[PDB]
Amino acid sequence: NTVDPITLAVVRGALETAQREMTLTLEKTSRSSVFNLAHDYSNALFDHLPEMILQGQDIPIHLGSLIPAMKCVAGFFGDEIAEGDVIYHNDPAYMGSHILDCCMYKPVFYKGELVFWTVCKGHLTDIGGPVPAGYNPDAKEIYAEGLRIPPVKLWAQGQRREDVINLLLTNMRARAYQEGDLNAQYGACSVGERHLIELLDRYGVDQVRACITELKDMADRHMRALLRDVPDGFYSGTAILEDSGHGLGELSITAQVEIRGDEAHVLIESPPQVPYFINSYAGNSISGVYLGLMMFAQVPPPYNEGLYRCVSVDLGPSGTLCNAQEPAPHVNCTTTPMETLADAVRLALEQAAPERVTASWGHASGINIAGHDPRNNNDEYVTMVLASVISGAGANKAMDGWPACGPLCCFGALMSGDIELLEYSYPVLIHRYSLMTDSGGAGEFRGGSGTRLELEPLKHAMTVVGFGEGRQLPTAGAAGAKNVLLEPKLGRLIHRHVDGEEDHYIQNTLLTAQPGERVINVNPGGGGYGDPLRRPLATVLADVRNGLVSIDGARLEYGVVIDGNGQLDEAATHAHRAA
Amino acid sequence: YRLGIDAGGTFTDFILADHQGNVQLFKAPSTPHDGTLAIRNGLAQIADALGRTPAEIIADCDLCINGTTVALNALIEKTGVKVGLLCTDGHEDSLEIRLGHKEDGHRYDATYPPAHMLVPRHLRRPIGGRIISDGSEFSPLDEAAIHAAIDYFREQQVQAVAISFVWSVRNPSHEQRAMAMVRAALPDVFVCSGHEVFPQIREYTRTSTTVVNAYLSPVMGRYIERIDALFEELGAQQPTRYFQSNGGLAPGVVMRERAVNAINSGPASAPQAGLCVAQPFGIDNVITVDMGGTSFDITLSKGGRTNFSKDSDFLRYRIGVPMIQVETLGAGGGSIAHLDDFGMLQVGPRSAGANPGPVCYGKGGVEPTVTDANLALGYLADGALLGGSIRLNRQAAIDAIRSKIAEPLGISVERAAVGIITLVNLSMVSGIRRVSIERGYDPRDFALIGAGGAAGMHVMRLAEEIGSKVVLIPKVASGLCAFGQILSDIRYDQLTTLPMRLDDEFVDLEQLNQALQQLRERGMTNLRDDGFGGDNRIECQYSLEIRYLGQIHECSVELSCDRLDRSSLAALRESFHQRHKALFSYSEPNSPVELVNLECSVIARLQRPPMPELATPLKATAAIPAGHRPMLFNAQDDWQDTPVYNGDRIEVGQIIQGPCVIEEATTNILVPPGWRVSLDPSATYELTPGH
Ligand SMILES: [Zn+2]
């Protein structure tokens, strides 16, 4: 109650400024824009005690993965850190991203007190699995995936812990990239500290932390006030995955959401964990459920822990797909299990909120991680993020869904590489990066169509996918989306310079390509909204002529039939609309 | 001998001057739908200054400089040219891809509906040919697709053709054959080409620029037909000149017509104007903050190359053509005191404007504004901002600040009044950062230059947070947007690409030098056909843009001597290293390998303009302290009787007393405590902490 409102807004806005400063430090140097996994990071400010005070949540893969991140990092180092130190980790012990996402932690000291932590993550090129992607389908003795890093100091009171930094430099296929990117993490964390120290100087911890507690309360009350306006009761969602574990079908994520007025409690109930890198751990599943929430409430605002003070989560017993402990020793996929998890949670929350039901996205389905010995006599490696960029922003009561949206597991902040940006940087021909026909949704509002990435190696190239869910696509739209006849993704290889056509169920083995041979993967599009017989007639005609839906499509999906004729045949239009 | 036209969209700024250097200002607002009103309805009034014939007197002007951004309006009005696209097979719809996502953060929503298309896949004609990263023709140009697409373009009534091919920036023969095929099909059809608009890397940006230029260029064509006719029929001796976003006057009478370099230029002269205001004071690096009740426009001149920009994104369309980097952030004077239902006093998102007006104006004003808090602080009394029906109400602002901001926030009327303004000033600080820190270093070295309208109410406060020692206020409020375009000389930006490594390999000196001197020849030819100043000295400053291996975004490097070799090659990297250092952290260099792009901008310094200046009799400034006003500056909390001065009768600058407000018939200047100000002969108030 002694929190001055003017100075409250000033404090929060200054924090927003520092967040942008750090995010830009990484944005233009980190190589995680079109070469490392694009925008697979979020920088965040955490409290004296491990509570997140502000996240500029740009990508939600770091939505609930950061809250119980500081718990174990800061709590395992009780008193024994000091000004100038950094802790570094990526491991999913009780937290953490897929272990290619590693991150640096710096605590801020002020005249002898610990005031807040700065956290700087970024997606790295390699982590040291037998597979250059780090995304390794052979998950025997799950230690096959790569190098796991518990809390280890890589800076100590202002100096490099060279002893260990060189332990981490090896076991990784990139060296200088890794090195520069850790340099950029230290830089970003340093400016994050400098501005905030300026804040403590202008205000004093007595003011900054008072206003911060107030902001946590503001987030808490905001989320609780929203929850007051949805009915109390027990709701559930259930959605499946089948193209998993050599394509073996498996049971669903059962997301029960129990809402009592101000608060909601979330149970998960997943099937048993697997010998595949799509196992999930604590922070991963937490981000999944939080994404279930965010997909229909709101994208924009600034974020902190307060938001989730009335959202309690319970993933179920350890050793299952959603909550693993050491019994599944590794995970590279915060993509495969999490998509189904997020769908289920959102389906529950929308079962409570018919007001805000949206259509499902394509999951992104589509990775292709490629590179090898170039024309430059070195190692050149990347994930073809392009292969997995765009499905379609589902479809809403008032939206066709943009086919320019990112991860498709996720809000969409991901950014594809441009062609020339890639053909100089990589020894390939990017043969096609075009958009699909009859790959999006079917409804009163259809979904966007996805990508066709057709890639050709110039001298030698390897191809790694392993990713699941490409034939049985549970992307179904809003209870009336039809999906009468549509193409999913196929991981296809044309080899031997003859019409190879080795069609792979997306869980691809390590493939290779010779000059002239082509690897193709496509991005399955988003769902549909409602009944497509109600999609505007001129709109369906345009959409067919636009070259995203064929006549063969239109006749069966929308009940708008075109012929080798001008407009649409008055009667052929309605003859097919019995249902 | 000079006329300048600054169509600002609210009024029209008409700038007229002769050998007196007198900044004679006229107004003539024009309908958004046709601009011939400014010319013919302004020239009648310039006849009224001496009593000379308005048809005769334009003949006495050696320059008619018209900055207008009707191309921006064309992008806005959903009005343009039905554009055909010639594109490379497999990448025909990349324009619609827009690199995945880039949209969350600048304009935002829950259900962002971005990217209304300029090409709808009806005009997305692919051509089967393909080349690669070194200029090798992997597959030849598909002339069949081109012919069929031309017939189809005739079918769909296409009006302009944009062409953007893969990797043509290093082997443009494919685009050249296609453009030849179109122009040689003998259609009355303007044709753009990638290598002839923005020949650099990142195809999406090149294609977007090409398609926008196809969308707009012939609109500017018709405009130049009408306006060249207007001015040459009104008696102008010299070719007409038009103000660009590069700071110079090319269009209409040159060998290159391109609207993409005319999009939202308008008041991009702001730094050119800032230096023309500040240079008699000896300030090297300056920042202008021009604002009205509409928005805030912030820009530097030098230091980090804030002088220019990167691949800009105009409104939803990615335009790469080099422009001066400025920041337009939010609503300024007539902005609303927004207070959300989330407990956050986020004053400043949306402009009340003049139409509902501030609560001051009473024309429908409900929400308190920056004007409303400004009056609540005692900065305005009777009405001294704009030339019309002003209708100054006062207490409604105080009570509205109370009940709409102060009362619900649990803060007093005085606190909310000061706080609205605090948050606005901090927003201006943030805008300053977007170009000062993000492109360089501590603004402590620069002078702010306020001008126009509401700037005088927040510059000082803003300077106090920015750290500027010197604040400059042109006494002629409209002087900034006038000087910066009137003193515009000839400026040609000529660019190209050259992937070449400076480290890890021996630089091919002959090749790098060749590309640099060829850009010089391109500049020489640009002036050859625009008009080369007679034994007039011109300058080409080189810029090389390089990066560390594996990064995406480069950094700029200045190049002074006109040819380059080893004894200055290594220092080149030094220029880069510190530069990268200055933007990111304190020690980067291990292998600053890759160079990407090369640029030379030729400047023909042709202006020989007159400027007004004063002289002084004595030391009195006796009768300026025009009464007193109860004023609250946030630093007192007692409302001292702070003095009010009449800015129009102030004798040649004598040192001013402490905290005060200077009101002129035109505008209003704050002077917070601790500052000392005098009116320099150059018609600029110098404000400096002399206390
Ligand atoms: Zn990641």
Distance between CA atoms of residues B16 and B359, nearest Å: 36
Distance between CA atoms of residues B369 and B347, nearest Å: 8
Chain B residues touching residue A389 (CB < 8 angstroms)? 97, 100
For residue B295, being part of any structural domain is answered with: no
- Say whether B422 and A10 touch across the interface (CB within 8 A): yes
Partners of residue A234 on adjacent β-strands: A258
Structure tokens at A101: 């996402």
Work out the number of other CB atoms within 10 angstroms of the CB of residue A378: 9
Decide: B672 and B464 in contact? Cβ < 8 Å: yes
Cα(A415) to ligand 1 centroid in Å equals 14
Mark which residues 572-611 of B lie under 8 Å from A by CB.
583-585, 588, 590-591
For residue A71, being part of any structural domain is answered with: yes
Sequence-separated contacts (24+) of A79-82 with Cβ below 8 Å:
A81/A107, A81/A153, A82/A109, A82/A157
DSSP-based three-state secondary structure for B504: coil
Single out the residue in B192, B221, B250 at which a domain terminates: B221
- Say whether A218 and B138 touch across the interface (CB within 8 A): no
Of B641, B609, B613, the C-alpha closest to B625 is B641
Decide: A443 and A535 in contact? Cβ < 8 Å: yes
Single out the residue in A197, A219, A241 at which a domain terminates: A219
Of B70, B36, B39, B16, the C-alpha closest to B482 is B16
Distance between CA atoms of residues A392 and B620, nearest Å: 73
Mark which residues 13-52 of B lie under 8 Å from A by CB.
none
Across the beta sheet with A311-314, what order do the strands follow?
A: A233-244, A248-260, A263-267, A311-314
Decide: A120 and A56 in contact? Cβ < 8 Å: no
Of A87, A15, A20, A23, the C-alpha closest to A53 is A15
Is the four-CA dihedral A342, A345, A351, A356 of positive or negative sign? Answer: negative
Mutate to test the interface with A, among B85, B87, B101 (most CBs of A within 10 A): B101
Torsion of CA A486, A487, A489, A495, to 10 degrees: 180
Distance between CA atoms of residues A335 and A92, nearest Å: 15
Structural domain containing residue B538: 491-604
Distance between CA atoms of residues A405 and A360, nearest Å: 13
Q: How many CA atoms lie within 13 A of A35 on its CB side?
A: 26
Q: Is A131 exposed, middle or buried (0-12, 13-18, 19+ CB in 10 A)?
A: buried
Q: Consult the annotation and say whether A504 binds a ligand.
A: no
The CA R_g of chain A, rounded to the nearest whole Å, is: 24
- Say whether A548 and B115 touch across the interface (CB within 8 A): no
Distance between CA atoms of residues A520 and A535, nearest Å: 32
For residue A568, being part of any structural domain is answered with: no
The C-alpha of B306 sits at a distance from chain A's nearest C-alpha, in angstroms, of 17
Task: Collect all residues with Cβ–Cβ distance below 8 Å to B501 and sequence separation of at least 6.
Answer: B507, B593, B594, B595
For residue A118, being part of any structural domain is answered with: yes
Is the four-CA dihedral B239, B243, B246, B252 of positive or negative sign? Answer: negative
In B2-133, which residue ranges form alpha helices assigned H by DSSP? 36-50, 54-57, 70-76, 94-97
Of B34, B173, B160, B106, the C-alpha closest to B316 is B106
- Say whether A546 and B204 touch across the interface (CB within 8 A): no
**C-alpha to C-alpha distances, B129 to B83, B142, B151, B181, B204, nearest whole angstrom:** 21, 5, 19, 15, 18
For residue B407, being part of any structural domain is answered with: no
In A333-465, where do the E strands start and end? Answer: 369-371, 381-383, 428-435, 451-457, 461-464
Q: Consult the annotation and say whether A101 binds a ligand.
A: yes
Mutate to test the interface with B, among A11, A389, A420, A522 (most CBs of B within 10 A): A420
Single out the residue in B604, B634, B665 at which a domain terminates: B604
Number of domains composing chain B:
2
Is the four-CA dihedral B164, B167, B171, B173 of positive or negative sign? Answer: negative
Most distant pair of Cα atoms in chain A: their distance: 82
| Closest chain B residue by Cα to residue A382 | B550
For residue B198, being part of any structural domain is answered with: yes
- Say whether B91 and A433 touch across the interface (CB within 8 A): yes
Residues in chain A: 579
Using the Cβ of B311 and the Cβ atoms of chain A, whether some distance falls under 8 Å is answered with: no
Distance between CA atoms of residues A417 and A565, nearest Å: 40
| Nearest beta carbon to residue B93 from set A9, A414, A434 | A434
DSSP state of A92: -
DSSP-based three-state secondary structure for B398: helix
Structural domain containing residue A165: 5-219
| Closest chain A residue by Cα to residue B99 | A416
User: Can you tell me which residue has the tokens 């013919």?
Assistant: B40
| Nearest beta carbon to residue A9 from set B104, B345, B415 | B345
Cα(A123) to ligand 1 centroid in Å equals 5
User: Can you tell me which residue has the tokens 């964990």?
Assistant: A273
Distance between CA atoms of residues A69 and A62, nearest Å: 10
Chain B residues touching residue A413 (CB < 8 angstroms)? 101, 104
Number of domains composing chain A:
2
The C-alpha of B585 sits at a distance from chain A's nearest C-alpha, in angstroms, of 5
In B81-142, which residue ranges form alpha helices assigned H by DSSP? 94-97
Decide: B24 and B13 in contact? Cβ < 8 Å: no
- Say whether A176 and B499 touch across the interface (CB within 8 A): no
- Say whether A413 and B104 touch across the interface (CB within 8 A): yes
Task: Give B418-467 as a DSSP string.
Answer: HHHHHHHHHHHHHHHHHHHTTTSS-GGGSEEE--BSTHHHHHHHHHHHHT
Using the Cβ of B152 and the Cβ atoms of chain A, whether some distance falls under 8 Å is answered with: no
Distance between CA atoms of residues B121 and B93, nearest Å: 7
**Quick one: how far is CA B67 from the chain centroid?**
11
Structure tokens at B310: 């990167």
Mark which residues 629-688 of B lie under 8 Å from A by CB.
none
User: Can you tell me which residue has the tokens 């090896």?
Assistant: A170
Using the Cβ of B94 and the Cβ atoms of chain A, whether some distance falls under 8 Å is answered with: yes
The angle at the Cα of A148, spanning A143 to A150, to the nearest 5 degrees, equals 135
| Closest chain B residue by Cα to residue A453 | B90
Most distant pair of Cα atoms in chain B: their distance: 84
User: Can you tell me which residue has the tokens 């942008």?
Assistant: A20
| Closest chain A residue by Cα to residue B419 | A6
Work out the number of other CB atoms within 10 angstroms of the CB of residue A32: 24
- Say whether A406 and B552 touch across the interface (CB within 8 A): no
For residue A331, being part of any structural domain is answered with: no
- Say whether A6 and B499 touch across the interface (CB within 8 A): no
| Nearest beta carbon to residue A186 from set B415, B418, B585 | B585
Decide: B493 and B541 in contact? Cβ < 8 Å: no
For residue A265, being part of any structural domain is answered with: no
Distance between CA atoms of residues B295 and B328, nearest Å: 7
- Say whether B551 and A31 touch across the interface (CB within 8 A): yes
For residue B689, being part of any structural domain is answered with: no
Mark which residues 111-150 of B lie under 8 Å from A by CB.
111-115, 120-122, 124, 130, 132-133, 138
Q: Reported resolution in A?
A: 4.0
Decide: A116 and A108 in contact? Cβ < 8 Å: yes
Is the four-CA dihedral B634, B636, B639, B643 of positive or negative sign? Answer: negative
DSSP-based three-state secondary structure for A162: helix
- Say whether A299 and B91 touch across the interface (CB within 8 A): no
Method: X-ray
| Closest chain B residue by Cα to residue A177 | B550
User: Can you tell me which residue has the tokens 């334009």?
Assistant: B58
Same structural domain, A519 and A371: yes
| Nearest beta carbon to residue A184 from set B104, B204, B584 | B584
Using the Cβ of B344 and the Cβ atoms of chain A, whether some distance falls under 8 Å is answered with: yes
- CATH code where residue B108 lies: 3.40.50
Q: Consult the annotation and say whether A460 binds a ligand.
A: no
Across the beta sheet with A381-383, what order do the strands follow?
A: A381-383, A369-371, A461-464, A511-513
For residue B584, being part of any structural domain is answered with: yes
For residue B102, being part of any structural domain is answered with: yes
Q: Consult the annotation and say whether A138 binds a ligand.
A: no
Task: Give B262-321 as a DSSP string.
Answer: GTT-STT-HHHHHHHHHGGGT-SSEEE--B-SS-BEEEESSSSSTTS-SSEEETTEEE-S
**C-alpha to C-alpha distances, B380 to A207, B630, B669, nearest whole angstrom:** 33, 11, 10
Question: Residue B597 is which amino acid?
Answer: N
Single out the residue in B604, B632, B663 at which a domain terminates: B604
For residue B180, being part of any structural domain is answered with: yes
| Nearest beta carbon to residue A421 from set B103, B422, B552 | B552
Scored b (16 or more CB within 10 A) or e, B542-576 reads bbbbbbbbbbbebbbbebeeeebeeeeeeebbebb
DSSP-based three-state secondary structure for B393: coil
| Nearest beta carbon to residue A218 from set B111, B343, B422 | B343
Q: Is A577 exposed, middle or buried (0-12, 13-18, 19+ CB in 10 A)?
A: exposed
For residue B228, being part of any structural domain is answered with: no
Mutate to test the interface with B, among A21, A27, A28, A190 (most CBs of B within 10 A): A28
